[PDB]
Design a binder for this molecule. Structure first.
Ligand SMILES: CN[C@@H]1[C@@H](O)[C@@H](O[C@@H]2[C@@H](O)[C@H](O[C@H]3OC(CN)=CC[C@H]3N)[C@@H](N)C[C@H]2N)OC[C@]1(C)O
Ligand SMILES: CN[C@@H]1[C@@H](O)[C@@H](O[C@@H]2[C@@H](O)[C@H](O[C@H]3OC(CN)=CC[C@H]3N)[C@@H](N)C[C@H]2N)OC[C@]1(C)O
Ligand SMILES: [Ca+2]
Ligand SMILES: [Ca+2]
Ligand SMILES: [Ca+2]
Ligand SMILES: [Mg+2]
Lengths: 152, 150
């Protein structure tokens, strides 16, 4: 069974090729139109940051899913928060346990680092993403409203 | 008012950062709260990805907000996440929160960011009322999930 072959890996600084592969998976799975990938100098800078962690799911050397996360150091606690910003699984591999393994590995990593909490969000209209998140034993869920300002 | 000043905190502003944290504790009615040690708070203030704005009447902090820079992989232009915003209860509904948002967006515009965002709980009418008054570009209904770690 694939469970005995799937590997979850946290990307290191030499993993720009795998990071680009995951961004391409995001482009495909989120159906991003007219996307121009940032230059590799920028993506390398991001991968080098101490507050950004990428996890990928691999079968052989093929990336079948992954997630991105940001560290938010807190002023209320000495234990940080982690914000999972994106998670996606290749459409051919969905509903096979990969997303759950990615969440498990991510939360294990941040537990070992002494973080307080990990969080992730889904759009109210995204039935697929909500059903997934509700299957990962989250501590709680809350309805929230997101506001943004597009800058000039 | 013209006496109101908006200040972006710098690395020599730990005392004002602590006053803003205490304002948060009071305005959010935070429970079972013990402030981190000042070594920790100074290290956070010194981060290149964290910016605090405060509102002052003379020496008194009457509101403020905190924000995190999120460098993107979909764009070279970054995002800013406004994490907390509060105004002292005695000074609310006098334009202070709107002035803080304006100053924050102006700052991130000058630095070439793509977008600033902020969130409110769906049950929090007061915070939803305030955010909608700041003329945001759009709003979206989302579900927030958290995992409390051992
Ligand atoms: C116009 N500027 C935009 C900016 O407002 C923001 O829009 C977000 C929107 O795409 C998100 O839904 C997409 O995102 C993902 C994961 N990446 C999965 C499903 C996708 N349909 C939504 N959850 C939050 C929205 N705020 O991010 C994109 C942007 C181009 O920067
Ligand atoms: C148990 N772990 C906790 C973690 O889940 C989280 O709880 C959040 C709670 O404070 C927030 O309430 C405050 O939000 C703010 C801004 N600070 C102003 C209005 C307040 N009502 C609520 N909006 C969302 C909750 N998830 O923060 C504390 C924690 C200890 O880390
Ligand atoms: Ca393209
Ligand atoms: Ca460039
Ligand atoms: Ca100052
Ligand atoms: Mg085209």
């Amino acid at each position: 069974e694939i469970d005995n072959f799937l590997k979850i890996e946290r990307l290191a600084e030499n993993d720009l090729p795998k990071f680009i592969q995951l961004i391409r998976l995001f482009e495909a799975v989120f159906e991003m139109k007219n996307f121009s990938i940032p230059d590799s100098e920028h993506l390398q800078k991001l991968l080098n940051q101490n507050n950004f962690y990428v996890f990928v799911a691999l079968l052989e050397n093929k990336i079948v899913g992954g997630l991105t996360s940001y560290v938010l150091e807190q002023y209320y606690s000495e234990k940080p928060l982690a914000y999972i910003y994106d998670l996606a699984v290749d459409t051919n591999w969905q509903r096979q346990g990969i997303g759950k393994k990615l969440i498990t590995a991510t939360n294990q990593f941040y537990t070992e680092k002494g973080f307080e909490e990990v969080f992730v969000q889904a759009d109210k209209v995204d039935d697929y993403a909500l059903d997934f998140a509700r299957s990962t034993k989250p501590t709680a869920e809350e309805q929230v409203v997101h506001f943004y300002y597009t800058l000039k």
